[PDB]
């Protein structure tokens, strides 16, 4: 196997890195225009094209978007969380499954896991201290004005949710956030919720929006000192970054080093930034 694609040459948004111990490889699934493409790497530095991990059949509910895939290993299988929409169906995140970290994925159920009555995106998976799965998602600011982030328990098989979605916070609660104007609306974006649990049980959430100071896309963090997914979430006043980058997640590499992965800048030349990250005084 040859890995000839330098990480510096990658052009993509919202990079989620799957660290797969089973095959001892890293996988980067990405939106490749109405399909999900997957690249593979031994070391995060050089990459190999492994083809398409998801191409929708004509009967798939969501024929549009294919935004921001995440892939999780869960109880021996692999689950792709990607956002879609269709004529006559609101945008939402749905879950697809494969026996392999590189796909092919098939729909777990043929509908969004996010609420059908809501425009939603960026559905992600958090596994809590007891091993139980949570869905985190955004309700789009074009609908809500002040963008919203929700949590909701998932059934053990990830096919359905339990209970009602719970509103964690609105984007305006973070002091660094500034409103943007698009599609006739001025409001605050919520993108990319992702929770990392610290050894003491406290939770950090990363998420993205635009900064009030300079209009840059950015990564913000919030802390739930209670260890409760539902909060209360306390927003940190400063963004992690000033490089117009966002949609971040964190992972431990094969050596156990904590890393962050996100794209920067936010237009024209978006590329993955994958770099070590550190926890100090309970936050990033
Ligand atoms: Cl399909
Ligand atoms: Cl995983
Ligand atoms: Mg993502
Ligand atoms: Mg609102």
Distance 21 CA to ligand 2 centre (A): 9
d(CA 126, CA 106): 21
Q: How far is CA 112 from CA 38, 70, 102, 118, 228, in A?
A: 22, 15, 22, 10, 25
| Per-residue CA distances from 189 to 86, 93, 116, 204, 272 (Å) | 22, 17, 20, 19, 21
Alpha helices, DSSP H only, in the chain?
A: 141-144
- Beta bridge partners, 166, equal 151
Number of H helices, E strands in the chain: 1, 22
Tell me the structure's resolution in angstroms, rounded to a single decimal.
1.5
**Residue 70 marked in a binding site:** yes
Bridge-partner residues for 71, per DSSP? 80
Task: For CA atoms 77, 277, 47, 219, give the dihedral sign.
Answer: positive
The dihedral region occupied by 247, where left means phi > 0, alpha psi between -120 and 50, and beta the remainder, is left
Residue ranges with CB less than 5 Å from ion ligand 2? 72-73
> How far apart, in whole angstroms, are the C-alpha atoms of residue 22 and residue 165?
33
Burial class from Cβ neighbours inside 10 Å (0-12, 13-18, 19+) for residue 88 reads exposed
Q: Using the mean position of ligand 4's atoms as its centre, give its distance from the Cα of residue 147 in Å.
A: 7
Q: How many CB atoms are located within 10 Å of the residue 24 CB?
A: 9
Is residue 62 a contact partner of residue 56, using CB atoms and an 8 Å limit?
yes
Specify the number of domains making up the chain: 1
Residue 155 per-residue DSSP state = P
**Ligand 3 geometric centre to CA of 46 (Å):** 21
CA distance 119 to 259: 31
Rounded Cα gap, residues 284 and 279, in angstroms: 5
- 29 known ligand binder: no
List all residues 6 or more positions away from 31 whose beta carbon is below 8 Å from its beta carbon: 12, 13, 14, 37, 66, 67, 68, 69, 82
C-beta atoms surrounding 82 within 10 Å: 26
Cα of 239 vs centre of ligand 2, distance in Å, is 26
User: What is the 270 CA–ligand 1 centroid distance (Å)?
Assistant: 28
| Ligand-binding site membership of 263 (annotated) | no
Q: Which two tokens stand for residue 173?
A: 């609660």
- Using CA atoms, how far apart are residues 6 and 169, in angstroms rounded to an integer? 38
CATH number at residue 107: 2.115.10.20
Determine the 3-state secondary structure of 101 from DSSP: coil
Say which ligand is closest to the CA of 147. Answer: 4
* Parent domain of 120: 1-284
Distance between Cα 262 and ligand 3 center (Å): 9
């Amino acid at each position: 196997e040859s890995f000839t694609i330098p990480v510096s040459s990658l052009r993509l948004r919202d990079p989620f890195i799957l660290v797969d111990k089973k095959t001892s490889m890293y996988y980067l699934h990405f939106n490749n225009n109405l399909k999900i493409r997957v690249y593979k790497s031994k070391d995060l530095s050089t990459w190999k094209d492994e083809g398409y991990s998801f191409i929708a059949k004509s009967d798939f509910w969501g024929q549009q978007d294919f935004w921001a895939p995440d892939v999780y290993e869960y109880e021996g299988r692999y689950y792709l969380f990607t956002t879609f929409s269709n004529a006559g169906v609101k945008r939402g995140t749905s879950i697809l499954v494969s026996d392999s970290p590189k796909g092919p994925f098939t729909p777990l159920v043929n509908k969004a896991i996010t609420p059908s009555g809501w425009m939603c995106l960026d559905g992600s998976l958090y596994i809590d201290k007891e091993g139980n799965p949570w869905l985190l998602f955004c309700r789009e600011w074009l609908e809500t004005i002040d963008g919203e982030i929700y949590a909701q328990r998932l059934a053990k098989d990830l096919k359905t949710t339990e209970g009602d979605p719970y509103l964690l916070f609105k984007a305006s609660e973070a002091p660094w956030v500034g409103s943007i104007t698009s599609s006739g609306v001025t409001g605050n974006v919520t993108d990319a919720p992702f929770i990392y649990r610290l050894d003491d049980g406290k939770l950090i959430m990363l998420w993205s929006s635009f900064r009030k100071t300079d209009g840059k896309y950015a990564i913000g963090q919030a802390v739930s000192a209670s260890g409760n997914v539902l909060g209360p979430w306390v927003q940190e006043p400063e963004t992690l970054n000033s490089d117009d980058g966002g949609h971040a997640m964190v992972f431990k590499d094969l050596k156990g080093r904590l890393m962050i992965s996100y794209h920067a800048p936010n237009s024209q030349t978006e590329h993955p930034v994958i770099t070590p990250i550190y926890i100090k005084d309970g936050k990033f």
